[PDB]
Copies of this chain bind each other. A is one copy, B any other.
Amino acid sequence: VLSAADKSNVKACWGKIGSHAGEYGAEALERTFCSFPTTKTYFPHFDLSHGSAQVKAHGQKVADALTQAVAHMDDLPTAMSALSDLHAYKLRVDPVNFKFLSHCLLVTLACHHPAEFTPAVHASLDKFFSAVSTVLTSKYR
């Protein structure tokens, strides 16, 4: 459960990142497919090759939901309820795969935004990405 300090860290970091989120989603997805090949099992209908425009497109969708998550950190079960059904009942992604993407998102933000990636902000984004990952792993039964 996200504190007052966490929310200001996240929103302040998400602002600096700004319009770049979508490209960071892309690279975070690429890094997930690269570093953890088992995640690609969920995307057999994707052209997954390096620099592919379906991964770019998809990472922008992932980014979109996260920006929407940044605005709704007081009630995340409500604002991700469409994604929540998609991930826990529709497709059903094993929770470990979320740890993979979450980590790779931190990797991407550290590579792109070093001045922002402080110890305290690193901490708040972890908390925020797994609070998103928990909502997403919901409706299994």
Contact = CB atoms under 8 A, between A and B. Distances in A.
Contacts of A1: 139, 141
Q: Which label, helix, strand, loop or mixed, suits the secondary structure of the A interface?
A: loop
Contacts of A123: 141
Interface string A115-131: 00000000100010010
Contact of A141 (B127, B139, B140, B141): B127
A140 B123 CA distance: 12
Interface residues of A, number: 7
A95 B139 CA distance: 17
A129 to B, nearest CB: 12
A1 B130 CA distance: 20
A29 to B, nearest CB: 24
Interface in A98-141: 123, 127, 130, 139-141
A76 B78 CA distance: 20
A124 to B, nearest CB: 10
**Most chain-B CB neighbours within 10 Å: which of A123, A127, A130, A141?**
A141
A139 B127 CA distance: 11
Contacts of A130: 140-141
6 contacts: A1-B139, A1-B141, A123-B141, A127-B141, A130-B140, A130-B141
Interface of A: 1, 123, 127, 130, 139-141
